[PDB]
Amino acid sequence: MAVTEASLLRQCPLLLPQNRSKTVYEGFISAQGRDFHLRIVLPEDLQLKNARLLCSWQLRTILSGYHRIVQQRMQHSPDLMSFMMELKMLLEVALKNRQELYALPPPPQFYSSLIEEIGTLGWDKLVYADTCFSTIKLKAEDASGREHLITLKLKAKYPAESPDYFVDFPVPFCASWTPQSSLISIYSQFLAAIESLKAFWDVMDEIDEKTWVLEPEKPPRSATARRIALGNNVSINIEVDPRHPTMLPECFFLGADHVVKPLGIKLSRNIHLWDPENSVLQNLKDVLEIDFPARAILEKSDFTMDCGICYAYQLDGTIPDQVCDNSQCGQPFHQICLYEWLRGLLTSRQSFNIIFGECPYCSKPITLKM
Amino acid sequence: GHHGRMLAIKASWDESGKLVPELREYCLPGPVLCAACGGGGRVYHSTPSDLCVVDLS
Amino acid sequence: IDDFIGSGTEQVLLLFKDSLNSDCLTSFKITDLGKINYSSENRYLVVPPLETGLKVCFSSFRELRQHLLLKEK
Ligand SMILES: [Zn+2]
Ligand SMILES: [Zn+2]
């Protein structure tokens, strides 16, 4: 209403004036389904510059910090009705920030329905459930015979809202949640996405089996990139499209410029012979017309594989990849080490994204492309 | 408390640049009969059922 | 009845008949009727979440009773 006779009732129903002279108000204030005790003594007149306002200790702990604003608002705010509206808004804000603090799950609807539904799935499936019962994790199997997990995070209200789904696989997983849907529904969707992506798994498994995969070491299921090692001190890195795995991936070659050239040339000339009915390896082998080593000895073959400046492997994710174009050195480096080195020396000259210089060990012309 | 009310206080100094007390109040079960503190934000409390523990760390 | 394992829970020890042997405290049976059971995770999983659910639900019950008596005042 307009006047503060009924509008106050309608906007703060649970503040009941105790005294005849409407000077003592007492009762409850509502915010996000929670009634808070409140007692608001006015002076003989309707002025808020000075008024008493006592609370429940519940309300004090919830009005921690905002003490300055309410004291300020008492002085700046014209009417009591508006003071209550404004106070409610701030208490709303305060609880909205403390949602890590005030979170609960209903015992009836929740725990039972969840137990029914996990039974509906089957207990071979479930692998992990948290003691707060928020997080659960489920398992599924490929037709190829691979285990893939799916994490769900559940709110106080599971069937109302979506539960937070976390899945490994690399294409963005889309889950049509309805209020009618349940874990079995999304599970069927999860298997469906698995069986769609089936080809990508099969490709990456064939690569990780029959090749010395290098730098996604122990790769996750999300990982789409594969730096394959081949010959010695040269590598091909490969990015693969999940929707079209058998299709040609983006591939190129690190190592010695004099060694790399016949690989790029031979690829370029024979690439029309690529065929998307075979496997990636079975295509690459007759396309590049070479074989791979299968674990020659992948932990130590016979090379100090360290940077030969920093004498480490694994500087900040980076691998020894930049090498010499020389039979006698063949010394790997890191991008960072060799860059800082060449950028110092007087001999070096920088074109656009390239720096030419002398290999530290052998003093032969070495190129670095940033 | 006895009936199971726990209270917690910490120094915040956040969001305004002044020290503000961040209070909680938990409602842990059972009429607490005893408790003590353990090194590393741990509390051992006891209900007439069990001795339970709480990790604040 | 006593805690002989030293786990933090009482157990029952049962001595079976003397017809077996003329030797003391042979043929024992220790049990808790829970997990502990000596003698001579599809279902074990979801119980802790259920116990916490019971306790929390009880705390919510006591909270509502408090809220109610406040409102009556
Ligand atoms: Zn290095
Ligand atoms: Zn060199």
UniProtKB/Swiss-Prot annotation, chain A:
Report the stretches of sequence that form zinc fingers (RING-type): 307-363
Pathway note: Protein modification; protein ubiquitination
Q: What is the effect of changing F166A?
A: Does not affect interaction with FANCI and FANCD2
What InterPro entries would the database entry show? Fancl (IPR026848), FANCL_C (IPR026850), FANCL_d2 (IPR043898), FANCL_d3 (IPR044037), FANCL_d3_sf (IPR043003), FancL_WD-rpt_cont_dom (IPR019162), UBQ-conjugating_enzyme/RWD (IPR016135), Znf_RING/FYVE/PHD (IPR013083)
Q: Where in the cell is it found?
A: Cytoplasm; Nucleus
Q: Which residues bind Zn(2+) 1?
A: C307, C310, H334, C337
List GO terms (cellular component aspect): chromatin; cytosol; Fanconi anaemia nuclear complex; intracellular membrane-bounded organelle; nuclear body; nuclear envelope; nucleoplasm; nucleus
Q: Name one GO biological process term.
A: regulation of cell population proliferation
Q: Which residues bind Zn(2+) 2?
A: C324, C329, C359, C362
Record-listed E.C. numbers: 2.3.2.27
UniProt entry keywords in alphabetical sequence:
Acetylation, Cytoplasm, DNA damage, DNA repair, Fanconi anemia, Metal-binding, Nucleus, Transferase, Ubl conjugation, Ubl conjugation pathway, Zinc, Zinc-finger
Positions carrying N-acetylalanine: A2
Q: Give GO terms: molecular function aspect only.
A: ubiquitin protein ligase activity; ubiquitin protein ligase binding; ubiquitin-protein transferase activity; zinc ion binding
Entries under SUPFAM superfamilies matching the protein: RING/U-box
Q: How is it modified after translation?
A: The RING-type zinc finger domain is monoubiquitinated in the presence of UBE2T and UBE2W.
- Stated consequence of mutating I309A: Loss of interaction with UBE2T
Region UBC-RWD region (URD), residue ranges:
104-294
Q: Which reaction does it catalyse?
A: S-ubiquitinyl-[E2 ubiquitin-conjugating enzyme]-L-cysteine + [acceptor protein]-L-lysine = [E2 ubiquitin-conjugating enzyme]-L-cysteine + N(6)-ubiquitinyl-[acceptor protein]-L-lysine
Q: Does the keyword Acetylation apply?
A: yes
Disease implicated: Fanconi anemia complementation group L: A disorder affecting all bone marrow elements and resulting in anemia, leukopenia and thrombopenia. It is associated with cardiac, renal and limb malformations, dermal pigmentary changes, and a predisposition to the development of malignancies. At the cellular level it is associated with hypersensitivity to DNA-damaging agents, chromosomal instability (increased chromosome breakage) and defective DNA repair.
Record's protein name: E3 ubiquitin-protein ligase FANCL
Curated annotation (Swiss-Prot), chain B:
Q: Per the UniProt record, which residue ranges are transmembrane?
A: none
Q: Where in the cell is it found?
A: Nucleus
Indicate the secretion signal residues. none
Q: What does this protein do?
A: Plays a role in Fanconi anemia-associated DNA damage response network. Regulates FANCD2 monoubiquitination and the stability of the FA core complex. Induces chromosomal instability as well as hypersensitivity to DNA cross-linking agents, when repressed.
Q: How does it assemble?
A: Belongs to the multisubunit FA complex composed of FANCA, FANCB, FANCC, FANCE, FANCF, FANCG, FANCL/PHF9, FANCM, FAAP24 and FAAP100. Forms a subcomplex with FANCB and FANCL.
What name appears for this protein in its UniProt entry? Fanconi anemia core complex-associated protein 100
Native source species:
Homo sapiens (Human)
Phylogenetic lineage:
Eukaryota, Metazoa, Chordata, Craniata, Vertebrata
Q: Which residues of the full protein are shown?
A: 316 to 372 of 881
Curated annotation (Swiss-Prot), chain C:
- The shown chain, on whole-protein numbering, covers 330 to 417 of 859
Summary of the function given for this chain in its UniProt record? DNA repair protein required for FANCD2 ubiquitination.
Q: What name is this protein filed under?
A: Fanconi anemia group B protein
Record localization: Nucleus
What is the originating organism of this protein?
Homo sapiens
Q: What disease association does UniProt give?
A: Fanconi anemia complementation group B: A disorder affecting all bone marrow elements and resulting in anemia, leukopenia and thrombopenia. It is associated with cardiac, renal and limb malformations, dermal pigmentary changes, and a predisposition to the development of malignancies. At the cellular level it is associated with hypersensitivity to DNA-damaging agents, chromosomal instability (increased chromosome breakage) and defective DNA repair. Some severe FANCB cases manifest features of VACTERL syndrome with hydrocephalus.
What is known about its subunit structure? Belongs to the multisubunit FA complex composed of FANCA, FANCB, FANCC, FANCE, FANCF, FANCG, FANCL/PHF9 and FANCM. The complex is not found in FA patients.
Q: Which domain of life is it from?
A: Eukaryota
Q: Which cysteine pairs make disulfide bonds?
A: none
Q: Report the gene name.
A: FANCB
